[PDB]
Scaffold this active site. Structure first.
Site, PDB file in Angstrom:
ATOM      1  N   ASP A  69      58.116  68.512  12.602  1.00  0.00           N
ATOM      2  CA  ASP A  69      59.159  67.528  12.838  1.00  0.00           C
ATOM      3  C   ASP A  69      59.844  66.920  11.613  1.00  0.00           C
ATOM      4  O   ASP A  69      59.229  66.149  10.873  1.00  0.00           O
ATOM      5  CB  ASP A  69      58.515  66.421  13.681  1.00  0.00           C
ATOM      6  CG  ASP A  69      59.471  65.337  14.090  1.00  0.00           C
ATOM      7  OD1 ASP A  69      58.971  64.281  14.526  1.00  0.00           O
ATOM      8  OD2 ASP A  69      60.698  65.530  13.998  1.00  0.00           O
ATOM      9  N   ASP A 104      67.140  66.886  13.408  1.00  0.00           N
ATOM     10  CA  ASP A 104      65.762  66.784  13.873  1.00  0.00           C
ATOM     11  C   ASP A 104      65.108  68.046  14.433  1.00  0.00           C
ATOM     12  O   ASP A 104      65.376  68.436  15.560  1.00  0.00           O
ATOM     13  CB  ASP A 104      65.712  65.664  14.912  1.00  0.00           C
ATOM     14  CG  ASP A 104      64.315  65.217  15.222  1.00  0.00           C
ATOM     15  OD1 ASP A 104      64.170  64.158  15.860  1.00  0.00           O
ATOM     16  OD2 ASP A 104      63.360  65.917  14.831  1.00  0.00           O
TER      17      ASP A 104
END
Ligand SMILES: CCc1nc(N)nc(N)c1-c1ccc2c3ccccc3n(CCCOC)c2c1
Ligand SMILES: *[C@@H]1O[C@H](CO)[C@@H](O)[C@H](O)[C@H]1NC(C)=O
Length: 333
Positions: A31, A219
């Site tokens: 992430d 992201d």
């Protein structure tokens, strides 16, 4: 080093990492949207069903474990996890780093019972680290073994045959095998966040959104491309989409025809075709089809900002450059 990633229904991308001695394995999402590392803990009460369905790290079985116990709570746009810090050796496709991670002891059924992965590895900056914990990439860089201070992401499209790689993350560079043309970098607004300046968003031939400019968060840990509740309501009306509870549907027969959506970044239009953002699982006019774009109001200091997640990365191979504080995009191959 590169890490093979598994693609689960185009909404979850994860890879393996080993923690402790002997190695205890976990499926994790890399992430760029967070900066902490966490995996489910054995101290997690089995009253939390999600802990019953995931790999749990057991400290008492690791001879390289270092206690800490400081509490931490990780907050994501779609859920929260809580626990305490621990230290041990983490393996990441070759590299071995002594990392400080969080052993989660509270893993909510909703949504984690829906997770195929066990935990998360934050690829963000220390500025966003909770508990001021040193991010795993910073540590790997310290070793001074990586050819370059960058990491690249490749998210393949879904597949019905377990013979194609779901995705791949490269530590220390890019993999030419999965991109064509040259990269086109953009500068991070501010270091400490993988967020860049996005000049505008267009739906067909009419830049009806993000005029005057806005923010774009790149992201890797997010499934879809997201925008402020406002922006999306306006984008979705232009597509004739109906707003459900968690997503936006469109009559399936109308999916192939939907217009292109372009994102103006660093001077180069990144265009997505209807095929790129719609889960065309049918052509029936009697069935609804989920769009791969959602509405997610991200609070300050990061938001308001759009979030370019998996839906965007499947089409554009992304490289995160720590040394030059810039993000690069190239056509995924
Ligand atoms: C990887 C952690 C994460 N990071 C960021 N920046 N945003 C999020 N919304 C999540 C976050 C949290 C819980 C779940 C979560 C829980 C159950 C099923 C799916 C879930 N996903 C989507 C995975 C996308 O992988 C590419 C989640 C994402
Ligand atoms: C936990 O780790 C932090 C980070 O260095 C450290 O400052 C703190 O003292 C540690 N806590 C304990 C009790 O191990």
């Amino acid at each position: 080093s590169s890490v093979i990633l598994t693609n689960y229904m185009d909404t979850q991308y994860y890879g393996e990492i080993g923690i402790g001695t002997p190695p205890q394995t976990f499926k994790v999402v890399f992430d760029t949207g967070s900066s902490n590392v966490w995996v489910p803990s054995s101290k997690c009460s089995r009253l939390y069903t999600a802990c019953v369905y995931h790999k749990l790290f057991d400290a008492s079985d690791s001879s390289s474990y270092k206690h800490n116990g400081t509490e931490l709570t990780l907050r994501y746009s779609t859920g929260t996890v809580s626990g305490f810090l621990s230290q041990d050796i983490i393996t990441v496709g070759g590299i071995t780093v002594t990392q400080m991670f969080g052993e989660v002891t509270e893993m909510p059924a909703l949504p984690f019972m829906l997770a195929e992965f066990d935990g998360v590895v934050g690829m963000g900056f220390i500025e966003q680290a909770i508990g001021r914990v040193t991010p795993i990439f910073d540590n790997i860089i310290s070793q001074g073994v990586l050819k370059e201070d960058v990491f690249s992401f490749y998210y393949n499209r879904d597949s019905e045959n377990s013979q194609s790689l779901g995705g791949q993350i490269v530590l220390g560079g890019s993999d030419p095998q999965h991109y064509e043309g040259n990269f086109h970098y953009i500068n991070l607004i501010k270091t400490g966040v993988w967020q860049i300046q996005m000049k505008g968003v267009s739906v067909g031939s009419s830049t009806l959104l993000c005029e005057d400019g806005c923010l774009a968060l790149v992201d890797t840990g997010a499934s879809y491309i997201s925008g402020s509740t406002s922006s999306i309501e306006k984008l979705m009306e232009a597509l004739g989409a109906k707003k459900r509870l968690f997503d936006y549907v469109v009559k399936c027969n109308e999916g192939p025809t939907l217009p292109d959506i372009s994102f103006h970044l660093g001077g180069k239009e990144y265009t997505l075709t209807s095929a790129d953002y719609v889960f065309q699982e049918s052509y029936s006019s009697k069935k609804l089809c989920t769009l791969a774009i959602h509405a997610m109001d991200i609070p300050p200091p990061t938001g308001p900002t759009w979030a370019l997640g998996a839906t965007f990365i499947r089409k554009f191979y992304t490289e995160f450059d720590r040394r030059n504080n810039r993000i690069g995009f190239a056509l995924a191959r």
